[PDB]
């Protein structure tokens, strides 16, 4: 009972470790060491790719560094596969099927640990950028599984990689209520964002910052500013530990495997036959429900991709160029007590804390008799207009749309106000309240939530959608309320009751 | 001059080769087409692969089409690493190269043919539009891509005017796969798998008690895979589509495919003075592929030849096809329905086809008892809380809303 | 490495050989170009020429008022014009074309056409 | 057929400011993946070569002082930070199918 075993290495000590694991975990069914190279060229590892066929008894095979022109031909014979040096998230898609059952984590898996910051914070002031990417789409729907159970308070950033354009986009970011800024791009637009928010004064006090790995390289770290929190995995460049526990993890499956039936080995050489070699998937199974104790990396296990089992992860604090190693967090435990955190702006501290302002913008539509949008004096000032006993009554500018027409957006005029609910806010901020800001909504609708035509997304439209997009705050007008608007909207009490 | 290669895998018929070939349908524009024949018999992708490398991709030819007999998948891999190493087109015409349904990245080409199954799900409900009879329920597999037309189907009706229903997506892969089929109720089960998992579920199905007659199954042809066999246990007179280069045959598709290169080839030599030749050597170019930010699919997508627009979407699939609706039959593997061509349905008597509940109601309209107006002239159909009419004209189809007290 | 050999004064329907040495790189593969500069600086275009050698193409409203040759094994390309109206009086410029090819990377120095 | 032209074609702003010029065109040409036009610049009598290749790729040897953006029918270059070579003239191309379309040109010059 002897099976061979394919391995893409880089060099031939990969091969000779490899050959000495086999026969380590020959003690058991007997086994064989068959060597690959890595190639170089795509097309010649798909030149060479059947060439180790030859030899049926390979059952699974080990690549290394993108592996893409050779691990579909595995999964084209369903070959269960080990992908170790694996950082691409186009992988994890096992809907493919030429995937492997996971090694460490490819990136987005230390969202969780991302998730498990506010275990130590409980912070709910929380900005997520995402540059637009299949990768990024993945991380944010982890983080919508993630959020499902707090800190929920701010939908997206979008940003689309490949031009520099940040503080253009992102100056809005300054202005929205929460100080933590978590970054998920490539390290180049890191390096962007870095010489931006230095620009923006966005990386000072206050401003607590969250990155992942991949961003972390020396071109980065030039434009890092010290204070940045960093992570970092546990036995990201310890091969040679990988590879001896992957050949205990495939001992193990072939320990179990030599005591099944209908074995019906694949066929001698790539072609020449049939291609629906049937006990392929099946060894994936057994693969799957295949386990390991302990090891030099520790104790592998599988998820439902076959991830890794609390991957450890080294967190680092880039302290005076220095990336001061905090503490490793374990999956359930955290980074204990160790190091000193310095926080990107001189802080000792953790800011527990965020910036409720005191100037709010309250956009609404004209809606007679509770809006009379009057045109401004020739100063832009208003008309005084008295009472019937004569007292002046509030106009507060109502800065309108660019319409003075719809029709002809240019005319961004100033529109000093006059209604019924004017004086119920001045009556409001008299007693409690702030300095806000006033604007006119374009479209002048009410809104529904229409269908939008582009593979199922629906919009609330009007002021529905201004405020659900943050560009208003509070919302008075003579408003109905239905329990559509009710699904995401906070209303307050009923004020003027109607028919 | 363009050096051209049409490849086949076996059941060759080589004089409709020579005959369609009309070199005055080219007539002297700027290209002249440089062809050459490939037959095949091979199982063998790694050789398709080797030998093509040897054959004149590297030294003469720099565009290619290619057909099949087979249901082969693994051929869509094969079509998009060729388009992820060479700018040399590909096509697909037929077999496991029509077969091909796979989303991709921005490619250099695509096997590209026919319709889609988001135009077989449009045509699906126009059939229920026409055929006046209500879906309810769908079951699918794990196969990538299930979720995009279910969700495109469902908010398709809820924008309508009238509306289907539905009770229940099965997004399934324990035989207590049965208790679940027993709570669909609809007379409409689409379903999105493949040949052998649809002859299990039909087993499945037989065993549950749902079969054939009360409730009947809708399938495209990619769940069909061959439009040629029952293998064990297809139930009678079901649906599908895929279906005309079955009318096509060979010498209209190589029609097809040789005057789309020869055309789209003086679409960029229009104005362009020359085209890119093809590299010396498929797997050891490396330097001369980055040459050519290729980006000639602005003029592979607009194609019109003999006054029909060729045009395809991104991914290649086919703007307007046409559309061939197939029945089975008891003892055969598919017969008949009618037609379909671009919003424009064609069906054979207008009958629904049946294996007593139902009774022939004669009336007159007599407000407000009885209220005839006509059908939507956006859709063609009654609304809610009216039904059809059937009134003689003078096919007696005339169909018009009924409804009243 | 380009340099645009000639030019000069022409007179109104009088033809005018224009020349430009090229060293640097070869001809049968490589794609080079032909451009106009007015003294209003409105670029228009002189010569399309073909990679190697090959077909050449006509911009419209010059067609027929020019021929291109390409002597590849000397490197320097040879442009015969014709019929030379008044509003031909322009800076030419040769410049070597991209890979892709509508782009250009290399350029002469450019010939004064009068 | 498609038309380039630049806007403005003739300014003269002081040292180290965002020094933005746009072009303009009839039909959109930057669809798929890339974009469409070569930025051309060099002073006046000598060639300067390109600078950026279709939206925003630098070549060989370039400053660092500009950059370069937009679609649809509407693409820009932004120079900043503002150097002190900068009395040159600037121009367009994205050709088509049909055969070269080019545009106007800016000449910029350096306030002091």
């Known amino acids: 009972k002897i099976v061979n075993i394919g391995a893409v290495l880089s060099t031939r000590k990969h091969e000779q470790m490899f050959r000495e694991a086999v026969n380590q975990a020959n003690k058991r069914i007997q086994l064989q060491a068959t060597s690959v190279t890595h190639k170089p060229n795509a097309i010649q590892m798909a030149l060479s790719v059947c060439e180790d066929l030859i030899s049926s008894q390979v059952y699974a095979i080990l690549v290394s560094h993108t592996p893409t022109p050779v691990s579909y031909t595995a999964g084209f014979y369903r070959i269960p596969v080990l992908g170790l040096t694996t950082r691409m998230s186009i992988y994890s898609d096992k809907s493919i099927h030429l995937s492997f059952l996971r090694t460490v984590p490819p990136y987005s898996h230390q969202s969780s640990v991302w998730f498990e910051m506010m275990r130590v914070y409980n912070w709910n002031h929380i900005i997520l950028l995402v540059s637009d990417d299949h990768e990024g789409r993945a991380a944010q729907k982890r983080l919508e599984t993630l959020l499902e159970e707090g800190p929920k308070a701010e939908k997206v950033l979008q940003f689309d990689p490949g031009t520099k354009n940040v503080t253009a986009l992102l100056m809005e970011a300054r202005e929205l209520e929460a100080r933590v800024i978590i970054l998920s791009a490539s390290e180049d637009d890191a390096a962007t964002v870095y010489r931006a928010a230095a620009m923006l004064d966005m990386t000072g006090s206050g401003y607590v910052w969250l990155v992942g790995e991949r961003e972390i390289s020396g071109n980065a770290l030039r434009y890092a500013p010290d204070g940045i929190i960093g992570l970092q995995l546990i036995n990201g460049k310890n091969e040679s530990a990988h590879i001896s526990d992957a050949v205990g993890v495939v001992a193990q499956a072939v320990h179990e495997l030599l005591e099944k039936e209908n074995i019906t080995d694949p066929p001698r050489g790539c072609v020449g036959n049939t291609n629906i070699w049937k006990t392929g998937p099946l060894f994936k199974r057994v693969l799957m429900s295949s386990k390991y104790a302990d090891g030099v990396t520790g104790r592998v296990e599988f998820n439902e991709d076959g991830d890794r089992k609390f991957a450890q992860y080294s967190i680092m604090n880039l302290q005076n160029r220095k990336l001061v190693q905090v503490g490793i967090y374990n999956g359930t435990h955290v980074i204990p007590n160790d190091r000193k955190i310095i926080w990107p702006g001189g802080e000792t501290e953790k800011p527990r804390g965020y910036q409720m302002s005191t100037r709010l913008k309250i956009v609404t539509i004209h809606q007679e008799p509770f809006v009379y949008v009057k045109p401004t004096m020739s100063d832009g000032t208003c008309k005084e207009e008295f009472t019937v006993n004569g007292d002046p009554v509030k106009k507060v500018i109502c800065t309108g749309p660019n319409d003075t027409s719809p029709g002809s957006p240019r005319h961004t005029v100033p529109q000093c106000c006059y209604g019924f609910c004017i004086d119920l806010l001045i009556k409001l901020a008299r007693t409690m309240q702030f300095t806000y800001e006033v604007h006119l909504v374009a479209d002048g609708k009410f809104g529904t939530q229409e269908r939008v035509q582009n593979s199922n997304k629906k919009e609330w439209n009007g002021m529905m959608g201004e405020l659900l997009s943050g560009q208003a705050d509070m919302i008075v007008a003579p408003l109905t309320i239905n329990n559509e608007r009710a699904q995401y909207i906070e209303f307050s009490k009923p004020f003027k009751y109607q028919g | 001059s363009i050096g051209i290669a049409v490849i086949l895998v076996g059941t060759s018929d080589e004089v409709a080769i020579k005959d369609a070939h009309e070199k005055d349908d080219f007539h002297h524009l700027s290209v002249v087409p440089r062809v050459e024949l490939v037959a095949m018999n091979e199982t063998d992708p790694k050789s398709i692969i080797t030998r093509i490398c040897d054959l004149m991709s590297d030294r003469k030819i720099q565009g290619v089409v290619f057909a099949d007999d087979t249901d082969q998948e693994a051929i869509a891999q094969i079509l998009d690493f060729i388009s992820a190493q060479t700018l040399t087109p590909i096509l697909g015409i037929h077999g496991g190269s029509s077969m091909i349904m796979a989303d991709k990245d921005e490619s250099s080409m695509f096997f590209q043919f026919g319709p889609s199954i988001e135009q077989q799900a449009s045509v699906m409900l126009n059939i229920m539009e026409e055929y006046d009879w209500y879906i309810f329920s769908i079951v699918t597999t794990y196969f990538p891509g299930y979720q995009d037309f279910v969700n495109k189907i469902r908010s398709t009706i809820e924008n309508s005017f009238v509306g289907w229903e539905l009770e229940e997506v099965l997004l399934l892969d324990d035989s207590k796969i049965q208790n679940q089929l027993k709570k669909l109720q609809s007379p409409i089960i689409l379903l999105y798998c493949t040949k052998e998992e649809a002859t299990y579920i039909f087993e499945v199905a037989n065993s549950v008690g749902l079969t054939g007659y009360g409730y009947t199954w809708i399938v495209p042809s990619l769940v069909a895979g061959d439009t040629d066999t029952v293998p064990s246990e297809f139930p009678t007179g079901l649906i599908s589509v895929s279906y005309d280069e079955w009318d096509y045959g060979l010498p209209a598709r190589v029609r097809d495919g040789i005057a789309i290169i020869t055309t789209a080839a003086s679409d960029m030599l229009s104005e362009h003075s020359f085209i890119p030749e093809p590299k010396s050597s498929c797997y050891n170019t490396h330097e001369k592929r980055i040459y050519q930010s290729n980006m000639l699919n602005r003029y592979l997508i607009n194609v019109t030849f003999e006054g029909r627009d060729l045009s395809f979407s991104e991914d290649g699939y086919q703007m307007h096809p046409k559309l061939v609706i197939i029945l089975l039959n008891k003892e055969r593997k598919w017969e008949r329905v009618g037609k379909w061509k671009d919003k424009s349905l064609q069906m054979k008597y207008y009958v629904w086809p049946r294996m007593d509940d139902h009774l022939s109601i004669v009336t007159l309209e007599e407000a407000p008892f009885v209220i005839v107006e006509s059908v939507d002239p956006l859709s063609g159909t009654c609304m809610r809380n009216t039904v059809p009419c059937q009134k003689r004209i003078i096919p007696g189809y005339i169909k018009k809303c009924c409804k009243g007290f | 490495k380009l340099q645009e050999s000639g030019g000069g004064s022409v007179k109104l329907g009088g033809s005018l050989k224009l020349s430009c040495v090229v060293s640097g790189f070869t001809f049968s593969t490589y794609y080079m170009s032909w451009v106009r500069q007015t003294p209003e600086k409105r670029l228009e275009l002189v010569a399309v020429?073909?990679?190697?050698?090959?077909?050449?193409y006509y911009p419209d409203n010059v067609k027929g008022r020019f021929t291109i040759s390409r002597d590849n094994a000397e490197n320097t390309l040879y442009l015969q014009m014709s019929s030379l109206k008044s509003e031909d009086t322009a800076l030419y410029y040769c410049?070597?074309?991209?890979?892709?090819?509508?782009?250009?990377?290399?350029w002469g120095q450019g010939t004064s056409v009068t | 057929d498609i038309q380039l032209t630049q806007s403005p074609a003739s300014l003269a702003v002081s040292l180290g400011q965002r020094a933005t010029i746009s072009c303009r065109a009839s039909?959109?040409?930057?669809?798929?993946?890339?974009?469409?036009m070569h930025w051309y610049q060099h002073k006046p009598g000598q060639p300067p070569k390109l600078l950026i290749k279709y939206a925003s790729n630098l070549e060989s040897g370039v400053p660092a002082r500009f950059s370069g953006s937009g679609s649809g029918t509407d693409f820009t270059l932004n120079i900043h930070p503002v150097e002190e070579e900068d009395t040159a003239t600037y121009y367009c191309q994205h050709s088509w199918e049909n055969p070269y379309t080019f545009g106007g040109g800016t000449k910029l010059e350096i306030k002091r």
């Open positions: 039909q959109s040409v930057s669809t798929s993946r890339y974009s469409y």
């Open positions: 410049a070597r074309r991209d890979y892709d090819g509508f782009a250009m990377d290399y």
């Open positions: 020429i073909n990679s190697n050698g090959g077909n050449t």
